[PDB]
Amino acid sequence: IRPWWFPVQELRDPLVFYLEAWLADELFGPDRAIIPEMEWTSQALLTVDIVDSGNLVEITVFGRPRVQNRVKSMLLCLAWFHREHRARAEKM
Amino acid sequence: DNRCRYILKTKFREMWKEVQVMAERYKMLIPFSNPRVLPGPFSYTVVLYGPAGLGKTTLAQKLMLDWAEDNLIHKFKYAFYLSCRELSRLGPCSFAELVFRDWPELQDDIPHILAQARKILFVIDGFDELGAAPGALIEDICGDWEKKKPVPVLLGSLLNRVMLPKAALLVTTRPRALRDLRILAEEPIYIRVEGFLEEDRRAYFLRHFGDEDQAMRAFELMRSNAALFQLGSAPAVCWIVCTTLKLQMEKGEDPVPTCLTRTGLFLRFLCSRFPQGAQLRGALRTLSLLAAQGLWAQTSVLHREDLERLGVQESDLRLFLDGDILRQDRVSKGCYSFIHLSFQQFLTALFYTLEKTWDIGDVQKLLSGVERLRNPDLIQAGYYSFGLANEKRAKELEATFGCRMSPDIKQELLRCDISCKGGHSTVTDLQELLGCLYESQEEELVKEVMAQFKEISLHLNAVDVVPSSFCVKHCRNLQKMSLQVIKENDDQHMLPFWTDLCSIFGSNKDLMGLAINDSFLSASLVRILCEQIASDTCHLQRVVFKNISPADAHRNLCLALRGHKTVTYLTLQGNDQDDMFPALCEVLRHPECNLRYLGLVSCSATTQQWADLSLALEVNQSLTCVNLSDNELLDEGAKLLYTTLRHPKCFLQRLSLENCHLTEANCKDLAAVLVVSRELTHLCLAKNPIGNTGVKFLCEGLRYPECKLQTLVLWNCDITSDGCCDLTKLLQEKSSLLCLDLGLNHIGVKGMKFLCEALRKPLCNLRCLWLWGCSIPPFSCEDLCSALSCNQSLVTLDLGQNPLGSSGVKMLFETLTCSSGTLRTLRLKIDDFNDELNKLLEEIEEKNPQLIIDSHDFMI
Amino acid sequence: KRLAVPCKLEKMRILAHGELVLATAISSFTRHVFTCGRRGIKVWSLTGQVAEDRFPESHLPIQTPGAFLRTCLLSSNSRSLLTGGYNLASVSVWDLAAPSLHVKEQLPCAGLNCQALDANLDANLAFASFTSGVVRIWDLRDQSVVRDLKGYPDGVKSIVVKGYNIWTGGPDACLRCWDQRTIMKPLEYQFKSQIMSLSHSPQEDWVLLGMANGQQWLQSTSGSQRHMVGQKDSVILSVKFSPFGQWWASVGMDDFLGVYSMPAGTKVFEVPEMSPVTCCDVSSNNRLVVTGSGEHASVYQITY
């Protein structure tokens, strides 16, 4: 269901990038309830699903390409922080 | 032959310088005897008409004597004098014996005299005194002198020129017989007699008194009273005044009080002229009866036969004769005439004043207006009867002649009262009432008559100042006054007269309104009037000044209004305004002024005057309604007025600009005012070409919810369908305006469509709607009927000059029967109605009872 | 720096509301324009190249019989929209963040008609004034109502709030400043023409006025200094101060919209309309200004 404030035209040509399943559950939560809030604050449309045997999650971002890059970079930085914290905890 | 002329001239010399002077003057006047008028050989009918006296008979006698002496042209071979008084008593006779009866030997000369028709001249005196009926004079003409007929038949035949067509005639009579003569006679020339001039009167006084100073004193006494001075045109009045004044001067009595009113002069002359004796009451009563009988029949000559039949004494006749009250004429032997008709009218009023078969009416008959129309002489009798009501004159008359007076005749005056308080009275009626009351010279009668007036209106000339000032001083129940002093084409003497008049403001306690129209004043009157206006005893509430001259008088009158503590309404008008504005601005700027309404009409102005007026209005904190009509405002003055209006300290609620020459730019500024202002509720714009763009700008102003205007007036404003659409668009929303006037606007079809489609919605709150001269067609009337069926809030509807006659009226009445709308008053015009329309009206009444089926300027 | 003052304004955008517009607002993100009419709110989108559009993205009507809308306000964060009018029993809050336009909580105003809208976002407070001459404060968080500022039937046509102070103005030609922390009377300043609009400088403590006679004045919050810079030939009923605090724009019955620069009150080149302009707003992005006049609205682009 397309939100009313998101134009229909921007749906075309989305950006797709992959991440790990545990990273997805850390970022968006197991219930994925935080997706609409990030969608609004970033002004882009997101889809989260696990597509590779439960190991790899696919994320699709809808919107203008600069907004796509900004959202992708923020998500990658958050995932990198989670990776660093997890590695430090496991080494401990 | 010549013996007849010899005897005639001998008798004339007995019955005969000033007389010669006036005879020569009128001989210049009259064409018949004028030396420079061609004496053509054809019949001349000369008629002399004039008021009583003035000596037309004397002129005739002098002309006949000039004929006898051969002093005149005397183209005529022989002439005769025919006295109507003798012919009055004569019975039926022939014309020849009628005319020859005076000379014992003319019967021999019958053929030569009657055949020579061109040689004979006739002179007739006192034709009105004949007493014959008009029917007898007109009917039964004849062409032969030998015929035996009654006297009036012969006189009418001679007058109608049926017999003796080559003879000439000259006749002297009262003006009443003029109509009868012009009906009966032919080829007429009419000459009027005026009488003595001013120099003649002065010379008469010089000759009677014999001294320059005394004669000048006596003359200037006569000039004091205008009514007497005019009456002096007759020699008899000059003789009476000369004798009375000479006797008063010799005795030592003050002549001015006698000269004040003519009634006192006549009464004094009558009292002095009659000798002493006893039982004069019977003689006076007989004289009064004779005067009244003669006046009723409009005659002033008495005959011996009637005197004997009534039973008169020879002694009384001689007593009247010796005093020159009545006079006997040798040529008109056995006939008596009165000294003057004025004296006869005085005696008739005296007769009615006296305590009590004849044709004498009653007092109310004389006072009745219909009889006044019947007998013109009765009005002067009314004046003298009012005058005789004076108590002092009655006491003097009872002392001298011994008669008695009745009070009931005085009550008759109040019974008729010459009622004038009604609106059917004219200006002349009020003038006559004032003149009669002044002639009365009694305060009680004037008080009792004047108590009826609730409003008064005076028009004053120089002669009108004294009586009006005497009368108006006594009225104390009036509530509205108007003045008008006409400019004439001594001031110290006039000082008390205008002092008395202006006193009405302080004496009366309900004179709320004062109006001064087209009055030209003087410095003393203006000073007194302003002293009275500025006084603290004034209680005026509405004042209207118009056309007051000169400019200094207008300015002085305006200046008295500064700080006035009672005037709440004011209106100003004038022809020249070069100094009105400074005084008006001084009045407005005053910190104590509290005038609540202001009105300027037709005043001319310039830009600077509008600027200072606007500044004074900004200073002013009192008025709530301003009316400007016909004022020559321009765009700049309108802009200054608007700048006065947008100030956050004004409180103008109602405003009118009619014929002020506005334009659409002023209308945009007005829209700005309506957006800004916070007190304007009613606005009127009439006779202004501001229809389309002006309506759009007003709409810009009106759309704002803050707008508080409740009434707009549009008249001759060229409202079109575009304006109708804009007004409908305004009306559909929740707007503040309740009323909307449209006049001389072609809204008949498209405008009607827009208004009806607006009216159908349940949201409308408009109360009143006026239509006039809109040319509403029937196909629009269908939608009008639909809208009237739909609506439930409109209260009044006015229609006129709109052709709804055949189908529109019927459809409207049928819908009115069907509908039950809330409108109360409905008015319409019907070209023609029928029985079906009448039963439709009955159905309208029975279907809705509250309707009444047959204001905006009143509200503003 | 002086470079903050703009130089040029241009526009190619037209919105056809269909009826006379009484208020306007623009989102800070520069995405949508909101116009308030007499009976309903309409929401419009800027993400297009259309010269003139007659169709909104949504129509939001009111259905109370005899209702009448008067004003609309948008908060800084581009989240909540407030609305109020005549003959309404309550004021509304509308939320933009959800995927579909849905209405939020309401608070009552029965028996009164309101023409004022101001909101302190961080404190979660809203401000409104009514024709009776009363100002009341609502809480947007817990829906509580606690305020009573009245006494003058007039002087409440315009509202501006700065921290704990509220500035009011109206037809009495008088200006008043209130304190939310005190129960005392306000402070009066007296002028000689009707006040029709207010706008406050966000950087330095100055308040801009618009007078009914075409005059413009600056009032300092220190209570002493006063300035007079500007003149127009007709009534002014709209002033708006840029978020950067360097310049403002004024509109009025003269139908002329021009840009002024602090503090000399010098004119920057202006743009003429065709009818009286009653609405003006500037985005928190400091790049767009929108106007409302007649049955239309416009969106202008600012060039520095």
Coordinates of C-alpha atoms in Angstrom, one line a residue, chain C:
Chain C
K1 CA 26.2 38.7 6.5
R2 CA 24.3 40.9 4.1
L3 CA 24.3 38.2 1.5
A4 CA 21.4 36.5 3.3
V5 CA 19.1 39.3 1.9
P6 CA 17.5 38.0 -1.3
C7 CA 17.6 39.6 -4.7
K8 CA 15.0 38.0 -7.0
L9 CA 11.7 36.2 -6.8
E10 CA 10.1 34.3 -9.7
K11 CA 7.3 31.9 -10.1
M12 CA 5.6 29.5 -12.5
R13 CA 2.9 27.7 -10.5
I14 CA -0.9 28.4 -10.1
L15 CA -3.4 26.7 -7.9
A16 CA -7.2 27.1 -8.6
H17 CA -9.0 26.7 -5.3
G18 CA -12.4 27.4 -6.8
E19 CA -13.5 29.9 -4.1
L20 CA -11.9 32.8 -2.2
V21 CA -9.0 31.6 0.0
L22 CA -8.5 32.9 3.6
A23 CA -5.3 31.2 4.7
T24 CA -2.2 29.4 3.3
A25 CA 0.6 27.3 4.6
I26 CA 3.7 25.5 3.1
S27 CA 5.7 22.5 4.3
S28 CA 9.3 23.1 5.3
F29 CA 10.5 20.2 3.1
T30 CA 8.9 22.1 0.2
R31 CA 6.6 19.3 -1.0
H32 CA 3.0 20.4 -0.4
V33 CA 0.9 23.5 -0.2
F34 CA -2.2 23.8 2.0
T35 CA -5.1 26.3 1.2
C36 CA -8.0 26.9 3.5
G37 CA -11.4 27.9 2.0
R38 CA -14.8 28.8 3.4
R39 CA -16.0 25.2 3.7
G40 CA -13.1 22.8 3.2
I41 CA -9.3 22.3 3.2
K42 CA -7.6 21.1 0.0
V43 CA -4.1 19.6 -0.1
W44 CA -1.9 20.0 -3.1
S45 CA 1.5 18.7 -4.4
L46 CA 4.5 20.6 -5.8
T47 CA 6.2 17.6 -7.3
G48 CA 5.2 18.4 -10.9
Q49 CA 5.9 20.7 -13.8
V50 CA 2.2 21.6 -14.4
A51 CA 1.7 25.4 -15.0
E52 CA -1.8 25.4 -13.5
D53 CA -3.7 22.6 -11.8
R54 CA -7.4 22.5 -10.9
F55 CA -7.4 19.2 -9.1
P56 CA -6.0 18.6 -5.5
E57 CA -4.5 15.4 -4.2
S58 CA -7.3 15.4 -1.6
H59 CA -10.4 17.3 -0.5
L60 CA -11.1 17.5 3.2
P61 CA -14.6 18.9 4.0
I62 CA -16.5 19.8 7.1
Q63 CA -20.1 18.5 7.4
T64 CA -21.6 20.4 10.4
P65 CA -24.7 22.2 9.2
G66 CA -24.0 25.9 8.9
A67 CA -20.3 25.4 9.4
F68 CA -17.7 28.0 8.4
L69 CA -13.9 27.6 8.2
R70 CA -11.6 30.6 8.8
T71 CA -7.9 29.7 9.2
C72 CA -5.3 27.0 9.0
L73 CA -1.8 26.6 10.5
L74 CA 1.1 24.2 9.9
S75 CA 3.7 23.5 12.5
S76 CA 7.5 23.7 11.8
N77 CA 8.2 20.0 11.7
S78 CA 5.7 19.5 8.8
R79 CA 3.8 16.9 10.9
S80 CA 0.5 18.4 12.3
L81 CA -2.0 20.8 10.7
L82 CA -4.5 22.8 12.7
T83 CA -7.8 24.2 11.6
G84 CA -10.6 26.3 13.0
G85 CA -13.6 28.3 12.0
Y86 CA -17.0 29.7 12.7
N87 CA -20.1 27.8 14.0
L88 CA -17.9 24.8 14.9
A89 CA -18.0 22.9 18.2
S90 CA -14.4 21.9 18.2
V91 CA -10.9 22.5 16.7
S92 CA -9.1 19.8 14.8
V93 CA -5.6 18.4 14.4
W94 CA -4.6 16.5 11.2
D95 CA -1.6 14.2 10.9
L96 CA 0.5 13.9 7.8
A97 CA 2.9 11.2 8.7
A98 CA 0.6 8.2 8.3
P99 CA 0.3 6.5 4.8
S100 CA -3.3 7.9 4.5
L101 CA -4.8 11.2 5.7
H102 CA -6.5 10.5 9.0
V103 CA -7.9 12.9 11.6
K104 CA -6.6 13.2 15.1
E105 CA -8.0 14.3 18.5
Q106 CA -10.2 17.3 18.9
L107 CA -10.8 20.0 21.5
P108 CA -14.0 22.0 22.1
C109 CA -14.7 25.7 21.4
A110 CA -18.5 25.7 21.5
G111 CA -20.2 29.1 21.6
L112 CA -17.2 30.9 20.2
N113 CA -15.7 31.8 16.8
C114 CA -11.9 31.9 16.4
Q115 CA -9.5 33.8 14.2
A116 CA -5.9 33.0 15.5
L117 CA -3.5 30.1 15.2
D118 CA 0.0 29.8 16.8
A119 CA 1.8 26.7 18.1
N120 CA 4.8 26.2 20.3
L121 CA 5.9 22.8 19.0
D122 CA 8.5 21.8 21.6
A123 CA 6.3 22.7 24.5
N124 CA 3.3 21.0 22.7
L125 CA 1.0 24.0 23.0
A126 CA -1.4 25.8 20.7
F127 CA -2.9 29.3 20.8
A128 CA -6.1 30.7 19.5
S129 CA -8.1 34.0 20.0
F130 CA -11.8 34.5 19.6
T131 CA -14.1 37.4 18.5
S132 CA -15.2 37.8 22.1
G133 CA -11.6 38.9 22.9
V134 CA -10.4 35.8 24.6
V135 CA -7.1 33.8 24.1
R136 CA -7.0 30.2 25.2
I137 CA -4.1 27.7 25.2
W138 CA -4.5 24.0 24.3
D139 CA -2.1 21.1 24.9
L140 CA -1.4 18.9 21.9
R141 CA 0.1 16.1 24.0
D142 CA -2.4 15.2 26.7
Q143 CA -5.3 17.3 25.3
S144 CA -5.6 19.5 28.4
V145 CA -6.9 23.1 28.3
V146 CA -5.7 25.8 30.7
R147 CA -5.7 29.5 29.8
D148 CA -7.8 32.6 30.2
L149 CA -6.5 35.9 28.6
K150 CA -9.3 38.3 27.9
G151 CA -10.6 41.8 29.0
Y152 CA -10.5 43.6 25.6
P153 CA -13.1 42.8 23.0
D154 CA -10.7 44.2 20.4
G155 CA -7.0 44.0 19.8
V156 CA -6.9 40.2 19.2
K157 CA -6.9 40.0 15.4
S158 CA -3.3 38.9 15.2
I159 CA -1.1 36.6 17.4
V160 CA 2.6 36.1 17.6
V161 CA 4.4 34.1 20.3
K162 CA 8.1 34.2 21.4
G163 CA 9.0 31.8 24.1
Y164 CA 7.0 32.9 27.2
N165 CA 5.6 36.1 25.6
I166 CA 2.5 36.6 23.4
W167 CA 2.1 39.7 21.2
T168 CA -1.4 40.9 20.2
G169 CA -2.8 43.7 18.0
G170 CA -6.0 44.9 16.5
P171 CA -8.3 47.8 15.6
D172 CA -7.7 49.8 18.8
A173 CA -4.3 50.9 17.2
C174 CA -2.8 49.5 20.4
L175 CA -0.1 46.8 20.9
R176 CA 0.0 44.5 23.9
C177 CA 2.6 42.0 25.2
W178 CA 1.6 39.2 27.6
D179 CA 3.6 36.9 29.9
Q180 CA 2.5 33.3 30.2
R181 CA 4.2 33.0 33.6
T182 CA 2.2 35.7 35.3
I183 CA -1.4 36.5 36.2
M184 CA -0.9 40.2 35.9
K185 CA -2.0 42.7 33.2
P186 CA 0.0 43.1 30.0
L187 CA 2.1 46.1 28.9
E188 CA 0.5 48.6 26.5
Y189 CA 2.1 50.5 23.6
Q190 CA 0.0 53.1 21.8
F191 CA 0.1 53.8 18.0
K192 CA -2.0 56.0 15.7
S193 CA -3.3 53.6 13.1
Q194 CA -5.0 50.2 13.1
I195 CA -2.7 47.2 13.4
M196 CA -3.5 44.5 10.9
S197 CA -0.6 42.0 11.0
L198 CA 2.4 40.9 13.1
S199 CA 5.7 39.1 12.6
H200 CA 8.6 38.6 14.9
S201 CA 12.3 38.5 14.1
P202 CA 13.8 35.1 15.1
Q203 CA 17.4 36.2 15.6
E204 CA 17.2 39.6 17.3
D205 CA 14.3 40.6 19.6
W206 CA 12.3 42.9 17.3
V207 CA 8.6 42.8 16.3
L208 CA 7.4 44.1 12.9
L209 CA 4.0 45.8 12.5
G210 CA 1.7 46.6 9.7
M211 CA -0.5 49.7 9.9
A212 CA -3.8 50.5 8.2
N213 CA -2.4 53.7 6.6
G214 CA 0.5 52.1 4.8
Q215 CA 3.2 52.6 7.5
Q216 CA 5.6 50.1 8.9
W217 CA 7.1 50.1 12.4
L218 CA 9.7 48.2 14.3
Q219 CA 9.2 47.6 18.1
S220 CA 12.2 46.4 20.2
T221 CA 11.5 44.1 23.2
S222 CA 13.5 46.4 25.5
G223 CA 10.4 48.6 25.6
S224 CA 12.0 51.9 24.6
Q225 CA 13.3 52.0 21.1
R226 CA 10.9 52.4 18.1
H227 CA 11.6 52.8 14.4
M228 CA 9.6 53.8 11.3
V229 CA 10.8 52.6 7.9
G230 CA 8.4 52.2 4.9
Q231 CA 5.4 53.6 3.3
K232 CA 2.6 52.1 1.1
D233 CA -0.4 53.9 -0.5
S234 CA -3.1 51.7 1.1
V235 CA -3.8 49.3 4.0
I236 CA -1.3 46.6 4.9
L237 CA -2.7 43.4 6.4
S238 CA 0.2 40.9 6.0
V239 CA 3.8 40.8 7.2
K240 CA 6.1 37.8 7.4
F241 CA 9.7 37.5 8.7
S242 CA 12.2 35.1 7.2
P243 CA 13.6 32.4 9.6
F244 CA 17.1 33.7 9.1
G245 CA 16.1 37.1 10.6
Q246 CA 17.5 39.3 7.9
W247 CA 14.5 40.3 5.7
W248 CA 10.7 40.4 5.5
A249 CA 7.8 40.7 3.0
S250 CA 4.7 42.8 3.3
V251 CA 1.3 42.7 1.5
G252 CA -1.9 44.6 1.8
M253 CA -4.9 46.2 0.1
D254 CA -2.5 47.9 -2.3
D255 CA -2.1 44.4 -3.8
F256 CA 1.7 45.0 -4.0
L257 CA 4.1 42.4 -2.6
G258 CA 7.7 43.7 -1.8
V259 CA 10.7 42.6 0.1
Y260 CA 12.4 44.8 2.8
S261 CA 15.8 44.5 4.5
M262 CA 16.6 45.1 8.2
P263 CA 17.3 47.6 9.7
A264 CA 17.3 50.5 7.2
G265 CA 13.9 49.4 5.8
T266 CA 15.1 49.6 2.3
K267 CA 13.1 48.2 -0.6
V268 CA 14.1 45.2 -2.7
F269 CA 12.3 44.9 -6.1
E270 CA 8.7 43.9 -5.8
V271 CA 6.1 41.9 -7.7
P272 CA 2.6 43.2 -8.5
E273 CA -0.7 41.3 -8.1
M274 CA -4.1 42.1 -9.6
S275 CA -6.3 42.0 -6.5
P276 CA -6.0 42.5 -2.7
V277 CA -3.6 40.0 -1.2
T278 CA -4.5 38.6 2.3
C279 CA -2.2 35.6 2.7
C280 CA 1.5 35.2 2.7
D281 CA 3.9 32.6 4.2
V282 CA 7.6 31.6 3.9
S283 CA 9.0 28.1 4.3
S284 CA 11.5 27.2 7.0
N285 CA 13.8 26.1 4.1
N286 CA 14.1 29.9 3.3
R287 CA 13.6 29.2 -0.4
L288 CA 9.9 29.5 -1.1
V289 CA 7.1 32.0 -0.3
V290 CA 3.4 31.3 -1.0
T291 CA 0.5 33.9 -1.3
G292 CA -3.2 33.8 -1.2
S293 CA -5.5 36.3 -3.1
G294 CA -8.9 35.7 -4.5
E295 CA -9.7 32.2 -5.5
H296 CA -6.1 31.4 -6.3
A297 CA -2.7 30.8 -4.6
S298 CA 0.9 31.0 -5.8
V299 CA 4.3 29.5 -5.0
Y300 CA 7.3 31.8 -5.4
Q301 CA 11.0 30.8 -5.7
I302 CA 13.6 32.8 -3.9
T303 CA 17.0 33.6 -5.5
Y304 CA 19.9 34.7 -3.3

